[PDB]
């Protein structure tokens, strides 16, 4: 049914090809992965939003699960690499953040989490849109330590409650990841580039302060919390994300609250004064 055009990427779970539907003529991204999973994933065919990469079809055959997605011409990680020398202009950053919070707000209203947001999962088009890829896949299959190609699954965007062993992730884990992504677009460097769970957690602690019962009630009771964690002081955001303005720094602070109950929701974030002058700029793309 599908003519492969080219290999475009490697997902957590399987290879992705650009492909053409042989009888509709449609160009699609075809994910090939080598049955609660099938039910859960089938449900995602109905979770449709303009900022969520469209799941067109789920095809289970021959010990393989094919997910047929809408095709987008570039990812944000590539966009960010391509703009390394002047950075993404702030208005486009704000537009992108605003549109991703809409995607989160939508899925979270339906109690679907992503749980593995990262630049690689943010795809863009020539219309100035940005969309979230792989929503719902982590609940269906888990998030493994390595991908199907053995590549290390990045920890850089992982919320602290996950690293401390909380088993019952809330929608707040996506807000944490998206705040790390926001900081990275602004500064052009990963905010917390951990290379192990403990290095990730100590990178967080060194910037935001080691958490305690004062900022995060119940934290000392979490499974992987140790009294022996070093006790680091918090730094000013002014130093973390220059030259983000006061509104942006205030929003980023609320997206990176330790306590998941206090972390801003996607819906409340949409109302933040940072978005008072939000516009939809069209980026420059080399296809
Ligand atoms: C599977 C679906 C989510 C998808 C739609 N467009 N598209 C593009 N397009 C960007 C692109 C186009 C052409 C060449 C390279 C990259 C790349 C890509 N890469 C594999 C992704 C899928 C999601 N997770 C991270 C992986 O890198 N996955 C997708």
Curated annotation (Swiss-Prot):
UniProt-reported outcome of changing residue 7 to F: Reduced phosphorylation by CAK
Modified residues (Phosphothreonine): 12, 149
Effect of residue 149 to A: Abolishes activity
Protein EC: 2.7.11.22
Protein family per UniProt: Belongs to the protein kinase superfamily. CMGC Ser/Thr protein kinase family. CDC2/CDKX subfamily.
Ways its activity is controlled: Phosphorylation at Thr-12 or Tyr-13 inactivates the enzyme, while phosphorylation at Thr-149 activates it.
The gene coding this protein: CDK2
Domain annotation Protein kinase: ranges: 2-275
Major place of residence: cytoplasm
GO biological process: cell division; cellular response to nitric oxide; cellular senescence; centriole replication; centrosome duplication; chromatin remodeling; DNA repair; DNA replication
Modified residues (N6-acetyllysine): 4
Site location (CDK7 binding): 7, 77-78, 155
Induction cue: Induced transiently by TGFB1 at an early phase of TGFB1-mediated apoptosis.
Protein name as it appears in the record: Cyclin-dependent kinase 2
Domain of life: Eukaryota
PTM field: Phosphorylated at Thr-149 by CDK7 in a CAK complex. Phosphorylation at Thr-149 promotes kinase activity, whereas phosphorylation at Tyr-13 by WEE1 reduces slightly kinase activity. Phosphorylated on Thr-12 and Tyr-13 during S and G2 phases before being dephosphorylated by CDC25A.
GO molecular function, one term: cyclin-dependent protein serine/threonine kinase activity
Record organism: Homo sapiens (Human)
SUPFAM superfamilies: Protein kinase-like (PK-like)
Keywords per UniProt: Acetylation, ATP-binding, Cell cycle, Cell division, Cytoplasm, Cytoskeleton, DNA damage, DNA repair, Endosome, Kinase, Magnesium, Meiosis, Metal-binding, Mitosis, Nucleotide-binding, Nucleus, Phosphoprotein, S-nitrosylation, Serine/threonine-protein kinase, Transferase
Free-text cofactor note: Binds 2 Mg(2+) ions.
A GO CC term attached to the entry: nucleus
